[PDB]
Design a protein around this ligand. Structure first.
Ligand SMILES: NC[C@@H]1O[C@H](O[C@H]2[C@@H](O)[C@H](O[C@@H]3[C@@H](O)[C@H](N)C[C@H](N)[C@H]3O[C@H]3O[C@H](CO)[C@@H](O)[C@H](O)[C@H]3N)O[C@@H]2CO)[C@H](N)[C@@H](O)[C@@H]1O
Ligand SMILES: [Mg+2]
Ligand SMILES: [Mg+2]
Ligand SMILES: [Mg+2]
Ligand SMILES: [Mg+2]
Lengths: 102, 71, 143, 300, 184, 212, 65
RNA sequence: GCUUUUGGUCGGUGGAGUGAUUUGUUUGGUUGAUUCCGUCAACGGACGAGAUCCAAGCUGCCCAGUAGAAUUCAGAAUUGCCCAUAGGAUAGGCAUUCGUCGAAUUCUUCUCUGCGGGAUUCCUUGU
RNA sequence: AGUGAGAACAAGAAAAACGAGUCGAACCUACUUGAUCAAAAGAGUGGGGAAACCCCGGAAUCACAUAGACUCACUUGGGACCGAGGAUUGCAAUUAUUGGUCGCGCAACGAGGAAUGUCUCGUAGGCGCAGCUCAUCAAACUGUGCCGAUUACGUCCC
């Protein structure tokens, strides 16, 4: 097989599962023999600034976070069958990436 | 593990009114009813509602409870 | 003609010790490949030995135990190992032996120290802003 | 009647019990609890503690609701509130397979006399049947229960009994529902069938041991116990009915309809029944209690 | 084959009792294969009286920033202490310690409750302050001394076990009791 | 090579943050109310939410044509890659971003401060909102500045659930004597589909269901 | 020094709350004159009831409350 | 930022007073909490508190040639007679060890993680 | 001065430029080399868009029956001060940017007056490591792990 790996990355946790479970529910209809969607570790991104724009006060801070959700799916279909699985209008803010393994 | 808020206590009396027959002296079975009869999102409140409901079922075995409106 | 094998784990702070307990011709317990006569401080070799000693040497008679620990530094890898061994004996007696022979030797572990079996749930508390640590604040001066 | 030992091994309420269906079975009862474990017991032979455990069956996380036994095999099933079912080997003590399709607690499990099909009754209102090969074969629909399915029993055609106050009867091989019988008006706690396959007794919060027959769908004699019923069991010979209740544990007759035994402990702590079991012959009784230990009662 | 632990595979806990019958519940004589245990003895109020008395000596050594957290050192430093105590006394060293804890702290003290009234001392604090004042004083002895810490610690334990006034604790145990007797 | 997935979530956020600032400055008197952009192959979508779709669109789309190519020439898009749309807000009374820009113009047209702010709250609360709160701060009366708040209905403020239920927007009003800032907070009522408001109820509302 | 047993803790006393007012039973050897004698005394340190302690001069009683 | 790590503020309509203003918002127990129970010229509400949210601890399903594990054949290494210069304390069917940059063929124990279980003063016996 | 065992959070390269609409180089890094001879370098050669390479992340406290030196001294404690080579960052190092080498160490300092700050459990304290400022520079701050206690579980005295 060609072993195409689709990378589903997103900033929303509810949009990354609504793509991946939808993308997986497409790739059961052609009996593609997928290797199941794995959840790569979510990377949180900290920017811990001061709160004040001036200098005084108690030196208070606020940490901001930004989690990146990351999924991959491996499927053995040919390269225009995986474009049949891929082609559907997704939610905004979810990036999909087609990669061919070896 | 302290005083139950009036959000917990007003809702727990309404479970005893509408669903007196489905409830007994156990926590872990009264909890499973309250997940089907209360549409709230928190599991922390639904644990506290099933605690104060169980308490005012032991009070209804003894006698009358004020504000219970069992009818 | 058979393979009698049991894997257990122990955690203390960040040290996760996985003990693969299997049946062999000889008892051979080694933590990360060091044969438990050679764990270097005599203090910490005695905490890993009281997984074996409070219950008896007879119960580890023909058991090859391999304890692979990672994380968490020197002292936490002894409490992770001695829990992975003491849980490792009992989960070898959950299968392969009856309940009467276990649950006496489970309670010999529980009577001695509660952390031979369960876990110590304590983790580091996060540092906060305005504080040098979890709790100690910056020094106030007034003048 | 006679009282032997006290048989205390669990840490938590003993929610179901079952005795194996064979002779020289070597284990007395498979008792199953609120600690999340099930225990296969054995005879003591040092009685001076009626029995010792053989194998503790560990591997459920949540509360374990029901237990069942194979008839011609060593296998046994436990059903738990972790929305899963595990099959066990009472020779080995070890789980073979985890049956997982429920999304709610699995309140009742039973195992066919044909020794090859699973049934499950859970809070997700669906009665599902499996094979012993682990795969889902079929699930029972088109007229299903509206609220929780509480009990299940195969009638040596499996029978329901539920929280929408009705008791539905269907075959297992076809799945069509024979009759949608209803008499209780409050939720049905327990459902068990006589060994002849002709009649069933059902208890609940209504407080009545309201009894039926599978033959025609006719409500027969019913008796009240004036207290909510936990579990009903039948004796295999010497046709009596033992009923687990909040008020006490008492054994009723069918033609006398009166207590032939009212089973009482030491007399200070009541320790309510929630589970009872008769042996394969019918000679001794096993009753499971809160305040956790398990009382065993031998014939007069 | 539960071979009933000694302490460093040498010193038995079989014969320990306390002369002070006031202090029997608060001096714990349970056995251990080493002082170090890493348990949470501080959650409940009186739970540190169930901690073994040989561990509580190791906790009293971890002071002053040069010792905070060095328990494996204090277990080693007490290993040589208990062997020296055997050579001075020709006795079981653990009985010498329990005899040192029992004599180490003042039975009476004086605080302002309202004047400076003489107040009785609880059995819990009498186990605390005996351990505290022996680790103290042995620490100050060896601060710029030729003597090692396992000798200065072994000397304070021995002289308090005999009730001699050469111990640091027994100079302060007798100073507090006579001030408390005059502040009655 | 390509940037890492951590480096691309940054530049996709700074894209939306800059695109939001441009349209907030342009379409202030067109009643602008947000952007959603959808990126794929062959085209990058940008949907603009507004209250005045005859004005954010030109006479033949002239205004959005210029507003398209301002985004194209800045972010270096090619021909065919960038397409813009305009959708209208269905309610206009549940959008705090639209109402504060109108309240900005009610003050800049020299109307009275309290007459203007109650005209918002009457219009917001008749549009099905559960509650509203208008704060006008600045030199309202004279030389020294004051602050007035005007309130009606519910308002959740302390939770972190107020991000889901309360819509907020603050603008500046450049008076002849100084600078006035106005704030408008609107508590979203309903709309389980997410038209305007969350699906789930408030975190403390229990609402026990009635038996059959 | 006589060894007395705390049969009652009467509350935290003093200004700073470090002193504890107890009621101590004297625990003598049952043929003695001062057997089963109970005294109301001030204890310094953490004290629960049923905690034995040594007493230097047992003929004093502390002023209660 | 700070008044303020505090439990506090506000209407409506009724009562009281010429009035500023009161009452509700309380003397009693209770809680970290105007948190609750009871009383009550008040009755009904709104906010804050609690709830929600994040993180950590135990756990389910899903999961892995971006995480790991066992095995079985092959390949290699040690292999016993050995008691340190002065040499203590301390487990023991098939001995053991692994860039050996081996082949295979079964697995999820640890790892990752989207939603979900679990804790409620729940049970017990003095206040 | 040796030697052993052995963490978690994390970061990581580029433009409508200059080069070969696609690809390179800027960033971090292992590994070799330099090495028939000091560090610090300087060079090759790989890899990595970062759970994929660094990485079996060989942190430092600690540990050690290391049969190692010192032995109570302002001393092999302390390392302030400054002298002389040298090499890297930069367009530029003087009012030493920083590292490394050998000197100096005869600079106080032997545990600190009146006063004063923070803290109740994986905590205080100790220990390092990342990130952030950053071409070059952390006695900082934001985070993270490691070792791990004393005391109280009280009161209104201030
Ligand atoms: N939003 C929480 C607030 O807690 C306040 O109460 C707080 C205080 O009573 C008390 O806070 C004290 C604080 O006063 C004092 N200045 C320092 C002390 N460490 C704090 O203690 C509190 O916080 C720390 C957590 O680091 C814990 O040690 C301790 O369990 C906890 N009681 O404990 C409560 C925090 O749990 C007020 N009830 C209220 O302002 C508010 O509810
Ligand atoms: Mg400061
Ligand atoms: Mg257009
Ligand atoms: Mg009025
Ligand atoms: Mg001075």
């Amino acid at each position: 097989g060609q072993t195409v790996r689709l990378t589903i990355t997103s900033r929303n946790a509810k949009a990354v599962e609504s793509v991946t479970s939808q993308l997986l529910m497409r790739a059961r209809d052609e009996k593609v023999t997928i290797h199941g969607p794995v959840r790569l570790p979510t990377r949180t991104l900290k920017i811990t600034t001061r709160k004040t724009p001036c200098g005084n006060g108690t030196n208070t801070w606020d940490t901001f976070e930004l989690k990146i959700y990351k999924r991959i799916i491996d499927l053995h279909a040919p390269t225009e069958q995986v474009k049949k699985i891929t082609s559907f209008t997704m939610e905004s803010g979810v990036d999909v990436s087609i990669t061919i393994l070896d | 593990g302290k005083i139950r808020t009036k959000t917990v206590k007003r809702a727990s009396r309404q479970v005893v009114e509408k669903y007196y027959s489905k409830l007994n002296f156990d926590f872990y079975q009264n909890k499973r009813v309250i997940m089907d009869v209360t549409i709230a999102e928190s599991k922390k409140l639904k644990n506290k509602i099933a605690g104060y409901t169980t308490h005012i079922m032991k009070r209804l075995a003894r006698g009358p409870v004020r504000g219970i409106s069992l009818k | 003609y058979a393979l009698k094998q049991v894997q257990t784990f122990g955690k203390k702070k960040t040290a996760i010790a996985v003990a693969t307990v299997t049946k062999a011709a000889q008892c051979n317990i080694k933590v990360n490949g060091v044969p438990l006569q050679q764990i270097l401080p005599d203090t910490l070799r005695a905490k890993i030995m009281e997984a074996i000693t409070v219950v008896g040497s007879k119960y580890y008679s023909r058991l090859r135990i391999d304890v692979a620990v990672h994380g968490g530094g020197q002292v936490s890898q002894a409490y992770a190992a001695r829990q992975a061994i003491a849980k490792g004996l009992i989960a070898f007696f959950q299968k392969y032996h009856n309940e009467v022979e276990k649950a006496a030797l489970k309670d010999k572990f529980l009577a001695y120290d509660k952390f031979l079996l369960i876990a110590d749930p304590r983790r580091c508390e996060p540092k906060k802003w305005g504080r040098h640590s979890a709790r100690t604040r910056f020094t106030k001066s007034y003048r | 009647m006679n009282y032997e030992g006290h048989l205390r091994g669990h840490r938590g309420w003993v929610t179901s019990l079952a005795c194996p269906e064979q002779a020289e079975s070597y284990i007395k009862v498979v008792s199953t609890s609120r600690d999340g474990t099930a225990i296969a017991w054995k005879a003591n032979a040092d009685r001076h503690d009626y029995g010792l455990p053989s194998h503790r069956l560990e591997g459920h996380t949540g509360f374990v609701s029901c237990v069942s036994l194979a008839h011609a095999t060593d296998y046994a099933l436990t059903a738990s509130w972790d929305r899963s079912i595990r099959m066990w080997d009472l020779r080995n003590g070890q789980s073979q397979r985890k049956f997982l399709k429920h999304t709610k607690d699995v309140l009742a499990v039973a195992f066919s006399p044909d020794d090859r099909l699973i049934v499950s009754a859970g809070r997700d209102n669906v009665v599902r049947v499996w094979n012993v090969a682990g795969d889902c074969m079929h699930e029972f629909l088109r007229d299903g229960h509206k609220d929780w399915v509480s009990s299940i029993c195969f009638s040596p055609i499996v029978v329901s009994g539920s929280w929408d106050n009705t008791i539905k009867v269907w075959n297992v091989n076809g799945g069509k529902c024979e009759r949608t019988l209803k008499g209780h008006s409050n939720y049905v706690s327990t459902v068990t069938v006589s060994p002849d396959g002709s009649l069933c007794a059902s208890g609940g919060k209504d407080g009545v041991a309201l009894l039926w027959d599978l033959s025609t769908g006719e409500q027969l004699f019913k008796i009240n116990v004036e207290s909510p019923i936990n579990q009903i069991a039948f004796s295999p010979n010497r046709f009596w009915m033992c009923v687990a209740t909040e008020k006490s544990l008492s054994v009723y007759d069918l033609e006398s309809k009166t207590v032939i035994a009212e089973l009482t402990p030491d007399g200070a702590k009541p320790s309510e029944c929630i589970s009872i079991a008769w042996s394969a012959d019918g000679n001794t009784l096993y009753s499971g209690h809160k305040d956790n230990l398990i009382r065993v009662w031998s014939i007069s | 084959s539960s071979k009933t632990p000694k302490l460093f595979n040498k010193w038995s806990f079989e014969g320990l009792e306390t002369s002070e019958l006031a202090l029997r519940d608060h001096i714990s004589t349970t056995a251990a294969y080493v002082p170090h245990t890493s348990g949470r003895w501080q959650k409940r109020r009186f739970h540190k009286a169930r901690m073994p008395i040989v561990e509580r000596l190791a906790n009293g050594l971890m002071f002053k920033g040069r010792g905070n957290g060095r328990k494996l050192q204090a277990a080693r430093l007490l290993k040589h202490t208990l062997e020296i105590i055997h050579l001075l006394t020709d006795e079981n060293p653990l009985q010498v310690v329990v005899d040192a804890v029992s004599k180490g702290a003042p039975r009476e003290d004086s605080t302002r409750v309202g004047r400076r009234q003489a107040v009785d001392v609880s059995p819990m604090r009498r186990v605390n302050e005996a351990i505290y004042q022996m680790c103290k004083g042995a620490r100050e002895a060896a601060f710029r001394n030729l003597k090692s810490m396992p000798e200065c610690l072994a000397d304070e334990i021995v002289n308090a076990s005999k009730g001699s006034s050469n111990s640091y604790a027994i100079k302060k145990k007798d100073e507090v009791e006579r001030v408390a007797k005059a502040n009655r | 090579g390509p940037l890492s997935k951590k480096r691309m979530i940054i530049r996709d956020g700074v894209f939306y943050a800059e695109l939001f600032e441009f349209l907030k400055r342009e379409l202030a008197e067109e009643g602008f109310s947000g952007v959603s952009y959808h990126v794929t192959t062959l085209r990058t979508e940008i949907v603009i939410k507004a209250t005045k779709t005859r004005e954010v669109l030109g006479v033949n789309g002239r205004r959005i044509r210029e507003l398209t190519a301002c985004i194209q020439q800045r972010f270096n898009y090619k021909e065919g890659k960038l397409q813009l749309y305009v959708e209208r807000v269905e309610v206009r009374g549940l959008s705090a971003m639209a109402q504060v820009e109108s309240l900005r113009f009610k003050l800049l047209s020299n109307l009275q401060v309290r007459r203007a702010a109650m005209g918002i709250i009457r219009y917001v609360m008749e549009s099905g909102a559960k509650g509203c709160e208008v704060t006008v701060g600045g030199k309202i009366k004279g030389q020294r500045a004051k602050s007035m708040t005007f309130r009606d209905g519910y308002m959740i403020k302390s939770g972190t659930a107020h991000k889901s239920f309360v819509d907020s927007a603050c603008r500046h009003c450049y008076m002849r004597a100084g600078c006035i800032g106005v704030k408008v907070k609107i508590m979203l009522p309903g709309d389980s589909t997410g038209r305007n408001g969350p699906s789930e109820p408030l975190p403390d509302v229990i609402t026990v269901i009635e038996p059959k | 020094a006589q060894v007395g047993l705390i049969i009652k803790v009467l509350g935290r006393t003093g200004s700073r709350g470090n002193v504890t007012q107890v009621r101590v039973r004297l625990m003598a050897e049952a043929g003695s004159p001062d057997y089963n004698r109970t005294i109301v005394r001030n204890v310094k340190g953490p004290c629960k009831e049923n905690d034995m302690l040594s007493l230097m001069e047992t003929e004093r009683e502390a002023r209660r409350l």
